[PDB]
């Protein structure tokens, strides 16, 4: 009958890059989901396969709180059946996704005047990600028939680029913190309720 550590994910001081997203595993606790959604602090709080208000009266075997940072333009892609550089090469939601996507603008916390290049995304990859695939390989992307052997140049580029977050960027070019709550099923016993 312990309360869930949702505060530890949502209110975490530093978040992750989107290609290297986190999976805090939630287990054995009570979650007041209605405390989270009435927060009215989110520019995006869009579930799928379940209702936000009916969520309090429910249970699951495991809740997975995935959290990362992207731009506001790409928030649309944190959804089932999306394309784009984030949806394809960084974080992919299944077409049978049954959780919630939550996002809020982070330009105050996550942007430095000289430019904050701490956050990153994956720009080059030979094929799309499987659902919930995390790819942290920094291997020089090969574009030609000629292999790279860890030496940049023509047809041989670093697979990762950097977000350029400045407080004067456009609102879409601004950083948005995303938290993705994935819900499983029963058959196996449940540990998270409300």
């Amino acid at each position, epitope marked *: 009958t*312990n309360l*869930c*550590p949702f505060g*530890e994910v949502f*209110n*975490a*001081t*530093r*978040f*992750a*890059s989107v290609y*290297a997203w*986190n*999976r*805090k*595993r939630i*287990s*054995n*606790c009570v979650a007041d989901y209605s405390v989270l959604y009435n927060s009215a602090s989110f520019s995006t709080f869009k579930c799928y396969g379940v209702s936000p208000t009916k969520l309090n009266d429910l249970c699951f075997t495991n809740v997975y709180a995935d959290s990362f940072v992207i731009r506001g333009d790409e928030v649309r892609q944190i959804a089932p059946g999306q394309t784009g550089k984030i949806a394809d090469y960084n974080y992919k939601l299944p077409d049978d996704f049954t959780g919630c996507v939550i996002a809020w603008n982070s330009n105050n916390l996550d942007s*430095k005047v000289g430019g*904050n*290049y*701490n956050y990153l995304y994956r720009l080059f990859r030979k094929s799309n990600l499987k659902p919930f695939e*995390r790819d*942290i*390989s920094t291997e020089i992307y090969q574009a030609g028939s000629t292999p790279c052997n860890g030496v940049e140049g023509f047809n041989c580029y670093f697979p990762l680029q*950097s977000y350029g977050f400045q407080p004067t960027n456009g609102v879409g070019y601004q950083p948005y913190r995303v938290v993705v709550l994935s819900f499983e099923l029963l058959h196996a016993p449940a540990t998270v309720c409300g």
Partner: antibody, heavy 118, light 109 residues
Framework: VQLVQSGSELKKPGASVKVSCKASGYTFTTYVMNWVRQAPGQGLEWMGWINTNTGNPTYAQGFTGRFVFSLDTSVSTASLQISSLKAEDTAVYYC????????????WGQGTTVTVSS | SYVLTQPPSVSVAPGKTARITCGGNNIGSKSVHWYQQKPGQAPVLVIYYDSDRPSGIPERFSGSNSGNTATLTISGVEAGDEADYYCQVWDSISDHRVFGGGTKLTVLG
């Protein structure tokens, strides 16, 4: 990605020492630098971090007063300076980089051993 | 600051499952990470995020974290798995990370 540290140091009590940590392979200022201490027969003990961007250092309770995290972005090198060495400062010191608190402490130097004996 | 409690030594037979516990005040609420330091070498990350495996670690390594103890479980214990094992947590608000006391795994081989 590579982290290479300075060689073994020997000092009398009350002396000073500065351990360097040259990096290579990535952008030095992108990722936080972290320092960890391991005394003989003990375990790893987190010392703190210096933000390689703003320069702001964080010292956990127990390493305040005599330690100085500094940087030299020109050579992609962080440095650890200790003032007024004590016998209990004798340990192996590691520089390690957090990508994030994800792969946190995911690249480590080979270690610099520091012995303080009178 | 925060406190982490490891068993100092654990004895397991070759091939069997070794279990190392990591105690802490409500540690299933945070993310635990496990390291493996052979004598004379730098620490190496074997499990981050309670259970997630880095690329290159054998499938034998799997983690756990709930309640107040994380649990590092090594599946097929091999002769080369003798080393010290530390558990580390990072505090979200404090931004401090805290290490444990260590655990010397000995193979009864």
């Amino acid at each position: 990605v590579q982290l290479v540290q300075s060689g073994s140091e020997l000092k009398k009590p009350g002396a000073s020492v500065k351990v360097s940590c040259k990096a290579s392979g990535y952008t030095f200022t992108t990722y936080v630098m972290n320092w960890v201490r391991q005394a003989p027969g003990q375990g790893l003990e987190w010392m703190g971090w210096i933000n390689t961007n703003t320069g702001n250092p964080t010292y956990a309770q127990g390493f305040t007063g005599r330690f100085v995290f500094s940087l030299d972005t020109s050579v992609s090198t962080a440095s650890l300076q200790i003032s007024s060495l004590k016998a209990e400062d004798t340990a192996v010191y590691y520089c390690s980089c957090e990508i994030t608190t994800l792969g946190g402490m995911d690249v480590w130097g080979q270690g610099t051993t520091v012995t303080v004996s009178s | 600051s925060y406190v982490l409690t490891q068993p100092p030594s654990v004895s397991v037979a070759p091939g069997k499952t070794a279990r190392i516990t990591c105690g802490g005040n409500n540690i299933g609420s945070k993310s635990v990470h496990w390291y493996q330091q052979k004598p004379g070498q730098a620490p190496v990350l074997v499990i981050y995020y309670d259970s997630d495996r880095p690329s290159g670690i054998p499938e034998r390594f799997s983690g756990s974290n709930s309640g107040n103890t994380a649990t590092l479980t090594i599946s097929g214990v091999e002769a080369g798995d003798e080393a010290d094992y530390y558990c580390q947590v990072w505090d979200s608000i404090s931004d401090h990370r805290v290490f444990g006391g260590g655990t010397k795994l000995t193979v009864l081989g």
